[PDB]
Amino acid sequence: HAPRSSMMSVEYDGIPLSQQSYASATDLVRTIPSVEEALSTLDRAAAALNARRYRDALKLYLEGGYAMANVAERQANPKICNLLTSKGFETLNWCARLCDWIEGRIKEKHPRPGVHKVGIPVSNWDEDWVGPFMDEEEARRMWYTPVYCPHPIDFSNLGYRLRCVETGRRPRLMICITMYNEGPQQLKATLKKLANNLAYLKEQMPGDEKSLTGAFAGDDVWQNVLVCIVADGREQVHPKTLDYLEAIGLYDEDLLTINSAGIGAQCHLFEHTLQLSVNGKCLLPIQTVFALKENKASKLDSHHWYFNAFAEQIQPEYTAVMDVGTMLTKSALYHLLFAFERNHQIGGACGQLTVDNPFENLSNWVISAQHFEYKISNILDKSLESCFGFISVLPGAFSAYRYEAIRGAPLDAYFQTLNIELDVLGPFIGNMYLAEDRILSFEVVARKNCNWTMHYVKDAVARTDVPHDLVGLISQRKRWLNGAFFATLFSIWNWGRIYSESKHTFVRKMAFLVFYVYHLLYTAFGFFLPANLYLALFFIVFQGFQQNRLEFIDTSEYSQTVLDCAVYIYNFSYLFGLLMLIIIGLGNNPKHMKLTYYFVGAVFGLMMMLSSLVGAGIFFSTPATVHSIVVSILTVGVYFIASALHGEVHHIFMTFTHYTALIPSFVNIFTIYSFCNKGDFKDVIAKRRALEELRREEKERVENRKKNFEAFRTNVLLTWAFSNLIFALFVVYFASSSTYMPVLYIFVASLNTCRLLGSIGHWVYIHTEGLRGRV
Amino acid sequence: HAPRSSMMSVEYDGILSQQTGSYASATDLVIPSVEEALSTLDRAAAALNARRYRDALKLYLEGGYAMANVAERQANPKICNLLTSKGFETLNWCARLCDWIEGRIKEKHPRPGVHKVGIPVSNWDEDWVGPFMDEEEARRMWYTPVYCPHPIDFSNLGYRLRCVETGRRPRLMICITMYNEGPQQLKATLKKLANNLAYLKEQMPGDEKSLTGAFAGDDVWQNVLVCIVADGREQVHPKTLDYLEAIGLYDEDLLTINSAGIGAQCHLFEHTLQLSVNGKCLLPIQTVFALKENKASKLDSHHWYFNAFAEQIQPEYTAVMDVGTMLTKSALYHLLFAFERNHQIGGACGQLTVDNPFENLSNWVISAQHFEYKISNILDKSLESCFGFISVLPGAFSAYRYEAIRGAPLDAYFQTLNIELDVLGPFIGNMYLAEDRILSFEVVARKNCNWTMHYVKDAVARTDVPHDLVGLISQRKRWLNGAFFATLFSIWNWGRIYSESKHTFVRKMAFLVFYVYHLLYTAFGFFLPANLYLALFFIVFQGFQQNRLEFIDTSEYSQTVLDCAVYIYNFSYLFGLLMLIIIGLGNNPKHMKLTYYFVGAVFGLMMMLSSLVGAGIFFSTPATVHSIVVSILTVGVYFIASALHGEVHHIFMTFTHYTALIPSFVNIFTIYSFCNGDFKDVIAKRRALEELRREEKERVENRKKNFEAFRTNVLLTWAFSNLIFALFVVYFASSSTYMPVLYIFVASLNTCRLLGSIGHWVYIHTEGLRGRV
Ligand SMILES: O=c1ccn([C@@H]2O[C@H](COP(=O)(O)OP(=O)(O)O)[C@@H](O)[C@H]2O)c(=O)[nH]1
Ligand SMILES: O=c1ccn([C@@H]2O[C@H](COP(=O)(O)OP(=O)(O)O)[C@@H](O)[C@H]2O)c(=O)[nH]1
Ligand SMILES: [Mn+2]
Ligand SMILES: [Mn+2]
């Protein structure tokens, strides 16, 4: 009791010691503004305008205007004084306009601050430079404007204009560069490659049958080409990248902050016909418009902005979409434009995607495997598809379209994920639209009342920098095969539109039906690819080792323990690896398990290298019958035949070992990880309750969306995995190698015959259409 | 070319503030209101939080004068008075802050003065019966917002409670954590607490069995404080808030007004609320309600409760329970009786049961949960309380005396909150995902203190278990996820009991014996899925295939069905397990109710047929002495303990339902648990801002990477250990060589649990007579 009394006594001493003048406080607060509070006040005004509170929006607008008007006087930097004075004057003009609008002397719908584009001198210039002809206004001045347009369809309706439109020049070919958290060297390489393309376009000889004629002639082509660089978020772009953009005279943080205070811009446009010099050669000027967007979005949203806003503004003749860090050959644009002009029927084209410096760093197995995969995918698949006038464009590939089969329905279908929220669409459409450039491909192919096909250009080589690590490749294939496994399902489900709506020729529709049957067979085979690979390895290797079917070894008697031990070890290792793959995939992100993924990949690697050696052994021990040699050459050397036919066989000769070492890891891991993922207080209280109910409804909608997405993905993954497992178990238990290996050989031979025929058709078409152009 | 020329001509025609080196009319166009006053105040609070003292005062005067002008126009007398009082207080705080800035008054970390406001309660009952009450306390309700970021300084910042102000010194102190529940659970909990207080009141005096001291009759309600702490005002149920207003404890108007510029961290509402049910008027109950704005954890609610309020009023015993936990009339009496008579228990745990077991007997999930609760309580709690160390069940109604929980145990409990979990790691994260048993271990192994624990059987606490298998999945997802790392902690740091704590030699020897048993039990339960699969496979299917079921002769048969049974069982089990891990480690187990129910039913009828063949195998065997001994000791241990403790009818009713849910239980729950200035200064400030944002994002992603990697590594270890063990025993051991081993292991575990239950019974029925010695 004594400690309790002592503690309460010290507490009682504790409570004693507003406890635990207005004129003086009034004098203190009365006793200058600043840029920080001015910017905060304009930000609050923009928020109020967004929330449609006009009285307090106005009240916060004149305060900020006068704050910057007073601040501009005391600043020391003349450019800062000019920027703040202009901002204050424009804000006062907008305040007067808003006051008049509220008074009603002028009637207008949805008032917004007037669109003001400002041109500030570029900090850095090269006095020693060579150019055909350029005006001081365009050359020296850098133009920037902030845009609020939420629906890029109304970008031109809100008075936004580009420097090309203002000077009256008419761009025809127009390229997009979607950049996000990329280093300066990638942008520098991309811009240097584009400048090289423009220079090579200039160097076309006039009066030649092969050379292009028209708006793409020499000495005047750079004017007709506009490059649009659209970033994904100002909070995610690399600081070194922004430093590079300032160095090339295209970005200014000070100007952006000053002139984007009260506008509440969704994205910022910087326009500059930037010129570049590399060593002693000076690149020709390239027209560049840089669209830096405020909030983080997706590549689909970047394309939404690009396509809708700028394309509907300037009506380009050809529209090109390209990633960041992709180096183009000198003649990539020439080949694209040549194909477009000579065909006058192509709705869209895809360039060849390759790996930068394949020969260099040959010690890296992942790089060589990716190079082999790119080369085989391009040659075989793209040739076969372009023979049929329909391309499943590789993600990230340098692709272009003509803005005549893209203007309407294909773009609406492409952007319907953004326009209509995916909750109504469902999870199938969302997974469809993770990668939808191929959706654009299909929509252009199936345009109503239009027969616009596609074409794959082998000569338009686009060199990119593929990931050098297995985890980066895993993430890449997480995106790629998903888009893929869903746009494919779209293609089967909607192949009827090509005949129901589009007006193709009868022969074209028959060819499309044939390609549809082939595509069904190929997708069905690739769906059971893990099961088929496991069965092939199991049967051939281990049931030749156990049943003495390897014609180079004699395992008739042996110890009888190792014979079954090999099969048991293989089955257990494969099953354990697959289960670990499920757990890790579906589980955590594939970056902290670099060691585990490398271990599993190496296990599969030596597993298919020993498989390759035993396959070569049985092949060489076989007496090489006519049928056997025919099927073997057709199924294996199809890659070498196509590569030698097209010219690039050395890449395959160098990378086939690296790819076949990475084949099981490739299929298993990548597919499994892809499939694995002035009111009063009563009004105040009512507003609080309404906001709370809005938050609750938003949370319930988000959780319902997540529930639907995860349920759909788990259902599709369970279907895929259980189908593979059931197929493998059933064939293992009810079919021998003699009854299943011939079937698998016939299936793979049919697919490889189709791909060889496609590549041969592409070659003969591209080498014979020139002479037979008259007929 | 014509369309392009036409389009450009159209743009030229459409192109009419218009589209280096008037204002008077707008000014003339340019009264206050409550909304802008609240917004202004609010920011002022944000600026003060950002240490913008030079700005703060001006917005504070703006808000103060805004409300000073607003209060006159309000027609509501109570709103007018409240706004006028808040404006006067805000102006006083503004003057004090101005003096502090001028420097005439020097103070550290200025903050608005803490003031408690007493408004009359909307609802009062004229007709009531009570011993004695003052009009001030009964008629009026007090409230105060708190800023204390570290609840350790609750008393330092000047916060006082009505008990402290009136001089009442609470001794028993009981917490009720609440989050997004409905009014009926709170009403049931408060009615049960009032019943407990009534039982404590009507205890006869001058009796050996009856309590004596501060818990006597007619005055017990004064000495007990109820602290109900919510988790977030954005998550509490609207109906719950209406109930709190009805009982005179909550006010949206008062909270919004008085919390405008304080930037409080939680809101305290104090009201000795009186409740009346039918013709019986319940005795008043001292209740303090702490509502915090931002969603937090039950650990954070306990942080607030323990640190702030316990360090303020220094209770003799502190107690913790959830909402929806109906306590019997004698639960509090039994807790206090045990505490007073022992003077050695550092913390106690009450029995957890299911509300209305007999009713709704058709619900297999309810019956299985009732069986699990009963057997867990009896066996595990009795065995653990015999050794004076309880792994308290999560959500159970537990209490600790505030003498072995004051310091180091509480610091160890809250260290996850005090120091960020990035330094601790994922082990400590899933360690403190549930740590009531962490309190248990710290109390047991507190340095220079030997405070054991005691499980009270008679203090029955009835809760409302989920009625759906998905709800049971989520419950077990929390429960044994915490429990596994709890056993890991106890296993790793069992050396502290001998190195630091000063227990008796016999107590340390008993603790060592229990440690050996706990090691064996945790090892057995780690391989529980593998052991269950082996038992089912061997017994059922290798008796069917090898003709070892003594009630049937399958010697010849068709030779196809014999292998077909084993193949079907293996394939179904493997497919079920793979689907389980995927569904478990993928999507949230609430959209897949059909799939989970299908797998659970498959396992259910599977163990029904397993039980039928076992019974056949137990009725066709000549029942030798060894066989009957092992079988009774391994199976009827539940019935023996239940008959010893008197609660055998529950087992008789729910054993079939539980054995129908054993494989789902063990497989699904274990899998789903283990499976989861100028312009330059402005620019520099922006650079600091998004650099800090990037650093925080990197830290969060690194924390997530580490936690997920540890989770996946542990899950891989568990699953692969189970699979390797199962495959090895299947391929290298027959049933005749592994069934005896499994029977001996389970018999040893059940013998330990039976001995613990019997010891608890004999102790609780013999310690009374042998109290002299
Ligand atoms: O959220 C994102 C991620 C990327 N990108 C950009 O859009 C393209 C997507 O290609 P990415 O490099 O992501 O694909 P990959 O080459 O990694 O397979 C690239 O230009 C990215 O910089 C984007 O706009 N938003
Ligand atoms: O984020 C949360 C979730 C719950 N709770 C509360 O803390 C206890 C957690 O027990 P839970 O309801 O999870 O267990 P159950 O009653 O479901 O078995 C309950 O009183 C919850 O209302 C909390 O404070 N914070
Ligand atoms: Mn890229
Ligand atoms: Mn509960």
Numbering used by the authors:
A (entry chain A): 23 to 39, 49 to 51, 77 to 87, 91 to 736, 762 to 859
B (entry chain B): 23 to 37, 39, 49 to 51, 59 to 60, 77 to 85, 91 to 736, 763 to 859
Verbatim from the authors:
Chitin is synthesized by chitin synthase (CHS), a membrane-integrated protein belonging to the glycosyltransferase family 2, consisting of a glycosyltransferase (GT) domain and a transmembrane (TM) region. In this study, we demonstrated that Phytophthora sojae chitin synthase (PsCHS) exhibits processivity and functions as a bifunctional enzyme, capable of catalyzing both the synthesis and membrane translocation of chitin. A short N-terminal domain (NTD) exists in some CHSs, like Phytophthora sojae chitin synthase 1 (PsCHS1), to stabilize the dimerization.
To capture the structure of chitin-bound PsCHS, we incubated the enzyme in the presence of UDP-GlcNAc and Mn2+ for 15 min or 40 min before cryo-EM sample preparation. However, only a UDP- and Mn2+-occupied structure was resolved for both samples with overall resolutions of 3.20 Å and 2.94 Å, respectively. Unfortunately, only the PsCHS structure with the UDP/Mn2+ bound was obtained, which represents the competitive substrate binding or post-translocation state. PsCHS forms a dimer, as previously reported. UDP and Mn2+ are positioned in the reaction cavity of the GT domain, where PsCHS stabilizes UDP via hydrogen bonding and π-π stacking interactions. Specifically, E241, D382, V383, T237, and Y239 form hydrogen bonds with the ribose moiety, while D291, K355, K358, and S361 bond with the uracil moiety. Y239 also participates in π-π stacking with the uracil ring and Mn2⁺ coordinates with the pyrophosphate group. IF1 and IF2 connect the GT domain and transmembrane helices, framing the entrance of the potential chitin translocation channel.
